[PDB]
Each structure stands twice: as C-alpha cells, then as structure tokens.
Write a protein that binds this ligand. Structure first.
Ligand code: K
Ligand code: MG
Ligand code: MG
Ligand code: MG
Ligand code: MG
Ligand code: MG
Ligand code: MG
Ligand code: NA
Lengths: 45, 179, 148, 59, 313, 57
RNA sequence: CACGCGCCGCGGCGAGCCCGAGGGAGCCCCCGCGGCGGAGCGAGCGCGAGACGCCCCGGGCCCGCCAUGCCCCUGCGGGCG
C-alpha cells in the first residue's frame, strides 16, 4: 500500500483518529455496563 | 516444541530470486529494476525482474517476422523482449518498429537499422520508461525445444511421443496388437 | 575437479550412500542389456517399443550418394539473391529482365512448396518440383524450368 | 456441536462470563496481522484492523 | 580520445588516437575461464609403471590357517593388495587422462581483447601489483628506436618514470618453500612491466632486466596479459606497435569486436535522475509493535485500554 | 523359509500423503468416445457459421 | 581415470555453427573439410507441410501412410472432396 499524502497530513489525521477512538471508547464502556446490569435484572424479573 | 504443524500445511516451494549468471551486466540490470519496482509497485517492472531471473532454457529467441506479426494492431507501441532477437531471411521486407532486447544478431540489427527502425537496450529503456508506459512484453514459445518433445512413456497406449534411440523391430511398434 | 564432487563429502560415513541393507555389490542385475524379455520386460515395454524382431527388406550395400537428395522450400528462394540485387529486382517487377535462379548451383535438387513468395516474376531451374510448388510459382508470374 | 462431540475426549468446554472474556483479552490478547503475532496494548490497533465492522476499541 | 607519445628522455613528442579495442567490456569471468583452460593445455603427462607391484608371484592361502585371506609370497609375506607393503595402487594413474581443454576461437579473442582493455584502466593496474605513481599516462607509448645495450634500456625506463616497478622485482628474488625447490623451480621473483614492439630491435636491450617480458604485437599471449588470472598489467608500447595495433584486429577475417556496454557508475546516474524519480510513490507508514505488558499492573497501562477507567482492577 | 504373503497396513497413509489427486480439467471434455455422426455435424456447423468460422476470408 | 548415453546450469555465436587432420618457422598467434542443424512420413516404388496463438493446455486445419466418390489434360497419370 502506497500513500500519496505528506508526513504532516498523516500526523494530523492520526491524531484526529486517535481522539475519535478515545471518545467512542468512553461512550461504549458506559453503554455496555448499563446493558449487562439490565440483562441480569430483567432475567430476575 | 510440542506443536502440530503437519496437518493442514504443505511443504515450502523454491523459486529463483537472483539471475545466477556471472555476467555483470545482467546483475546490474536486475538490481536496478528491482529497485524501481520497490519504489513504485508496478506490475510491468515486477514481471520484467522475474523474466530477468530466468534461465537460458526458459528464454527462447524471437524472430523479426514473429515480432512484425505480433505488432499488427499496435504499431506505435514498443516491443520489449528479455531474450535475443534473431533474423528471418524468409521475410523479404520488414516494417518500421521499436524493439528493446537483451541482444541482437548483427544481421537483425542491420535489418532493423535499415527500414528506419530503432534497436534499444534495457539501459535506455530504464532511462526513458522505467514503468513501461506504452510498452508490450513478449516472449517466445517455451515448448519448442527438441528435448521437450521426448518427455513421457513411448510404449504406453495413450502417449504420443517417440522413443529416444533407433529401433528396428516390430514388437509393440505396429499398433495396439503388435505385442 | 575433485574438490567439488559429491563423493568427497561422504568421508566418515561408512557405506558412501549405497545403503546398509542392500550395499554396493558387483553386478546385482547382470551385465549390459541382458534380460530384456525376462526380468527387465517392464522397462523394455515402457520405453523401447519396436526393439525386438525384424521389419522391411534389406539392402546388402547401400549406395550413399545415389540416395542423397537435398530440397529447398519455395519460401527460401529469394534469400539466395544478395541484398542489393534483391532490392533492385523487387523494385522493377520486370517481365523481360526477370531474375534467374538455378538451385542446383547452390546444392539442391527438388523444390518444395512451403511458405509464400513475393509478388514478382522469377525463373527457377531445378531437377524436380512438387505439385504445389509449381502452382504457387505460376500464380506469382514465374515459370519453372528443368536444368541438366 | 457434532464435531465437538467427535473430539470430546481431547477438550473441555463451557459457557464463559464477561469477566472471564475481559481478563483473557486484556492479559493474554494477541492479534494476527499479516501472519504475525502482534500484542494488543491499545485501542489504535483494533480500530485500524476492525473499523470496517464497527469495532473501534476493546469494549 | 587521444594518446600522448613520449621520447626517450620523457618529453611528449607526438600524438595518436585510441584504438577501438580499448572500448571492449571488462569480463573477469571470461578471462578467468580462458586462463584456466589455456594453462591446463601446457602440462606434461605423468603416470606410474604398469608393472609396479605385480612382478612377484603371490597367491592366497585359504581359510583355516588363522591368517587373513589376501595373497602371500612363498615365505608368507603379504603382496599385491593396496594395503600391503609393496603392492600396487588401487587405481594406478595413467597417461590416457585428458590433459588439454578446448576453447572456441571467438572466446579466446574475446578474452585477449578484454585483458587489453583492462590494461588501460590505471585503477586496475594499481589494484594489481604495480608501482605506477610516477607514470605519465596510461596507455604508455614510447618512441625508443632500437636499443641493444641494457644501460640504454635502463635509461629509458628511468626516463618514463617506471623504474620503481623494475626495482620492486629486482629486490624480491628468494628461494621457494616446500618441494619444488628440488624440481628445478628453486627461485621466485615478482612480475614487472611488459614491452610490446613491432619492427624494432629492443629485445636485446630489455632481455636481462628482472621481471620484464617481451611480446611481438601480432601474437600477444593471454597468460602474459593476466598473470595469475588477474587482468591489469602495466604495458610499455613502442610507437610502431601502437600504430599497428590500430589495425592488427582488421586482419582477423570476419571478426567483429564485441559491443560496449554500461558500467556500475553509469547506472546510479540513471537511477538518480528526475525522469525516473517522477514515478516514485511513498509507501504507507509501517505497523507499530510494542511488548506485551499487564494492563492491571499500572493505571497508565489500564488507561491505554479503557480510557473511562471503569474496570474495577 | 517362508516370508509374508500380503499386507495393506501402510497403504492408506501413503495414498493421503500428498492428497488424492483430482483428474485434469480437460479430461471432462474429450471427444475420446463420442458418436461419430454427432462429431461430424458439430464440425460442419461451426465451419459454415460466419461468426465462428476459422476459414480464411 | 577413459569412452558412450540421458537430463540440468553457465559462456560464445545464432538459421547457422564448428582450435578436424594439416599448413604458415610463434606451446597461448594466423588459415583450415566433413559433420550436426535446417522437413517429415513411408516396407518400398516414393510423395511432401501455413489458418488461427504473449506463454501453457485444448480445439481447428495442413503433409505422409490406408480406403473411397466425382471431374479431366500428357492417363493404374493429374485435380477436387
Ligand atoms: K620391496
Ligand atoms: Mg568406521
Ligand atoms: Mg541393491
Ligand atoms: Mg555391506
Ligand atoms: Mg610400489
Ligand atoms: Mg613441509
Ligand atoms: Mg516378500
Ligand atoms: Na499450439
């Protein structure tokens, strides 16, 4: 795989991608903790 | 240690990666085209380096008449051959064309120089068209050797090859019921 | 040279690549081609059909220079003319100054008909022709002749 | 299931919990990338290799 | 492409053009192959006597006497076998061995031309053993007329600044190691310059200088151009020899000198040009690889995997 | 002095060593034993078809 | 180790190629025939190849051997299938 873009563009896009990933991680962690708790409670009910 | 590695796996294969010839010209050309391919990933260059690694038995010669017949719908392109170009006296007249080869016969070279054509070396091809823009890659017939025609078992019913020596008898040589 | 031979790399091994159970003995199958119809029948039948028996009539003394008979195809004829005369003759498709070729002077007896000819009249002298060779020659304007 | 039953006497199996799965991936997780065994220590690798299936982190 | 000519005192006097034989490609492999074959064609044969070890009367005793089964002489001495003292060779050497080798004429001509082309390279002449710091030019051409006294030859040699190579050889005479010193090969000296002449009398003047060899221009020997199979040898040309070499190759009927080709230095010039550079396209950044560590060991490692920090351990 | 007469003990393992080779992909379309009248008609129909005839001009 | 046969790698030249014996007073320089290759098949009298193709496989056509139908000159000979 051959990339046409320069080094600085790669660096900036890499930083943007990292930030996006971090935010998604936080959101998903919260959502899935809620989901597991809810599953257990609903089965008991 | 202690692992199974022979259940869904086959033995390794051996392929040529270097020209194997003492001629320094061929080593230089192979290394240069390998560098060019490393820095561009183009398919023309990959096939060219592979061809430059082939052995002599796998690089049949090409005639001027065959080259002419192969350039019928593409007279403006450049013919690239990784072998020697020989002459064909059976052809009285030849057109104008551009050919890049490893070697030319003196007669083939002179015939091409007349008629206004151009004989090119791989060094000049690398200098001008490293990625082979407007280029056609051609080869000869690999099954034309006389050795190739004697592979197999002559005495079996379903083979179509001849025995190697000289045979003077009749047993098994005059049909399916000669035995 | 003996430095690079495979046999020199077996010193220290006892039997030199011939095995322990079998070993290297003198003539374990016989001498020469013996056994062709007996214990070597499979080998002879697979690779040498027509090795045993007779076939055809016999000549007690072949006359070697009577059977000699070189041939040339009609597509090799123009290569006998040198290049300068070649272009000269091709340019003028003359019917009164046609080139005359005598293949016997070049070492050929019969003319065969493989290939094609340039479109230009020519006279060819030989001792024999094939059926098609004459047909192709007359369709290009030439004529065949018989030479002593 | 039928293949597992055929190989039964060589394996043991069962149903895992979320905690087991998380511990396995965090402590003993490696990725197959181009036939190499690459350690998993951050979410960038997962995102780079599995983004096209909407998988962006360990969670 | 011109060549300077010098006089007997070291001053330029004339000028000649470069003969085409000096543009041939350098092929060490071909020179080596031809040197090997030609040098094997000069040996004299040797072999043992066909009667050696088989002039006695010896027959095997059988089993039953508590001795090995090889042939014995009347007193009981072992005989004949190659492991017996006095026996014959297992496979005695014979004179019907193939002593010579065949080389095609075209390849012999190629080898001599390539060695000549190597002799005009300076760098190769230095890589081979030759002291040519004080030499004006390569090729070295000298107008010597006729030389019959060794003193005058030495005068010329000093004039053209080649004396250090003659003294290199004159001081290196010594006695050879091992056997061979008793086989008429007692003394060894190094190799000096080579003189090529034509219609001139220089042999008598140059014969007795140690390390020097002479050759007529119409019959140059390959074993002298590449001693030990190493091609670059220092050559002194007379003017007539150079001028004639101009066309000694035109008398080889129906022979064409091999075509010149490019060398190593000419390749990176092509590869570093812009025309080839325009096609280069950068490759993506490589994969990042780090050692595996336990995330729960430290909070930084854990944060690398779960930024929220919601994992109890 | 008697020796063994027969065993097939190791033969199945030797067969599977390099897999079981499949036939060539040209053995399925050979004309080796087809009815001659059908083969002759196929030849003539192709030759007279302008769009698939290999006759020159 | 010598000679013969098969296949593989490398060098030179390439529809060509070739230090045969030998001769020129130059171990290494110059000149130097056969031969092999280039057309096959057929017991033989004999007849004798182009239509397609980066390469490989396969089809399709063409030559020789065997058998047949139609036409015709110079005729148990020629041509077409
Ligand atoms: K003795
Ligand atoms: Mg031992
Ligand atoms: Mg045995
Ligand atoms: Mg034994
Ligand atoms: Mg002795
Ligand atoms: Mg000692
Ligand atoms: Mg048994
Ligand atoms: Na084909």
């Amino acid at each position: 795989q051959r990339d046409i873009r320069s080094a600085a563009e790669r660096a900036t896009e890499k930083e943007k991608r990292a930030a996006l990933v971090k935010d998604h991680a936080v959101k998903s962690a919260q959502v899935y903790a809620r989901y597991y708790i809810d599953l257990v409670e609903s089965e008991k009910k | 240690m202690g692992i199974d590695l022979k259940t869904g796996i086959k033995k390794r294969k051996v392929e040529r990666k270097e020209p194997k010839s003492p001629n320094p010209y061929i080593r230089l050309l192979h290394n240069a085209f390998k560098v060019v391919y490393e820095n561009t990933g183009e398919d023309f260059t990959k096939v060219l380096t592979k061809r430059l690694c082939l052995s002599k038995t796998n690089r049949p010669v090409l005639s001027v008449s065959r080259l002419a017949h192969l350039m019928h719908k593409r007279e403006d392109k450049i013919a690239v051959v990784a072998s020697t170009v020989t002459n064909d006296e059976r052809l009285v007249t030849i057109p104008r064309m551009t050919i890049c080869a490893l070697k030319f016969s003196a007669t083939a070279r002179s015939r091409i120089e007349k008629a206004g054509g151009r004989c090119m070396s791989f060094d000049e091809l690398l200098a001008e068209k490293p990625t082979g823009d407007n280029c056609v890659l051609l080869q000869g017939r690999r099954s034309c050797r006389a050795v190739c025609k004697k592979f197999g078992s002559p005495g079996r019913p379903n083979s179509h090859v001849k025995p190697k020596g000289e045979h003077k008898g009749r047993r098994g040589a005059r049909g399916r019921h000669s035995w | 040279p003996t430095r690079i031979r495979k046999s020199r790399k077996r010193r220290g091994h006892r039997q030199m690549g011939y095995g322990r159970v079998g070993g290297h003995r003198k003539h374990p199958s016989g001498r020469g081609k013996a056994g062709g119809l007996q214990h070597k029948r499979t080998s002879f039948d697979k690779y040498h059909p027509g090795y045993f028996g007779k076939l055809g009539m016999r000549n007690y003394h072949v006359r070697r220079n009577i059977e000699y008979n070189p041939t040339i195809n009609i597509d090799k004829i123009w290569s006998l003319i040198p290049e300068e005369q070649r272009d000269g003759f091709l340019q003028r498709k003359s019917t009164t100054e046609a080139p005359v070729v005598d293949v016997t002077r070049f070492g050929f007896f019969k003319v065969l008909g493989r290939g094609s000819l340039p479109q230009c009249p020519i006279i060819i002298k030989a001792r024999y022709f094939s059926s098609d060779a004459e047909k192709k020659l007359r369709e290009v304007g030439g004529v065949p002749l018989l030479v002593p | 299931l039928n293949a597992l039953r055929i190989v039964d006497h060589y394996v043991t199996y069962g149903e895992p919990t979320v905690e087991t799965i998380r511990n396995l991936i965090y402590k003993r997780g490696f990725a197959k990338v181009n036939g190499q065994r690459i350690p998993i220590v951050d979410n960038n690798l997962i995102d780079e290799q599995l983004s096209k299936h909407n998988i962006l982190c360990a969670e | 492409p011109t060549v300077k000519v010098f006089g007997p005192t070291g001053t330029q006097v004339a000028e000649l053009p470069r003969p085409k034989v000096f543009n041939v490609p350098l092929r060490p492999d071909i020179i080596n192959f031809v040197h090997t074959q030609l040098r094997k064609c000069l040996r004299t044969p040797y072999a043992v006597s066909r009667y050696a070890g088989v002039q006695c009367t010896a027959h095997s005793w059988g089993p039953g006497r508590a001795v090995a089964r090889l042939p014995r002489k009347h007193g009981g001495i072992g005989a004949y076998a190659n492991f017996a003292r006095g026996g014959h060779m297992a496979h005695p050497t014979t004179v019907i061995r193939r002593w010579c080798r065949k080389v095609n004429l075209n390849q012999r001509r190629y080898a001599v031309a390539s060695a000549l082309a190597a002799s005009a390279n300076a760098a190769l002449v230095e890589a081979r053993g030759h002291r040519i710091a004080d030499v004006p030019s390569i090729p070295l051409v000298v107008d010597t007329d006729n030389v019959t006294k060794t003193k005058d030859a030495l005068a010329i040699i000093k004039a053209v600044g080649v004396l250090r190579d003659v003294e290199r050889c004159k001081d290196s005479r010594h006695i050879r190691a091992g056997r061979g010193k008793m086989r008429n090969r007692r003394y060894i000296t190094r190799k000096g310059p080579l003189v090529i002449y034509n219609t001139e009398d220089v042999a008598r003047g140059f014969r007795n200088l140690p390390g020097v060899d002479l050759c007529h221009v119409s019959s140059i020997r390959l074993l002298e151009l590449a001693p030990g199979s190493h091609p670059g040898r220092l050559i002194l040309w007379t003017k007539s020899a150079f001028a004639s070499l101009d066309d000694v190759y035109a008398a080889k009927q129906n022979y064409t000198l091999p075509r010149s080709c490019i060398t190593q230095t000419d390749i990176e010039r092509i590869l570093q040009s812009d025309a080839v550079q325009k096609t280069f396209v950068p490759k993506r950044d490589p994969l990042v690889i780090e050692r595996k560590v336990d995330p729960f060991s430290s909070k930084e490692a854990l944060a690398r995997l779960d930024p929220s920090g919601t994992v109890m351990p | 002095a008697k020796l063994k007469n027969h065993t097939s003990k190791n033969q199945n393992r030797k067969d599977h060593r390099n897999g079981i080779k499949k036939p060539k992909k040209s053995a399925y379309t050979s004309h080796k034993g087809m009815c001659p009248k059908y083969l002759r008609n196929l030849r003539r129909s192709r030759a007279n078809d302008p769009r698939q005839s290999l006759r020159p001009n």
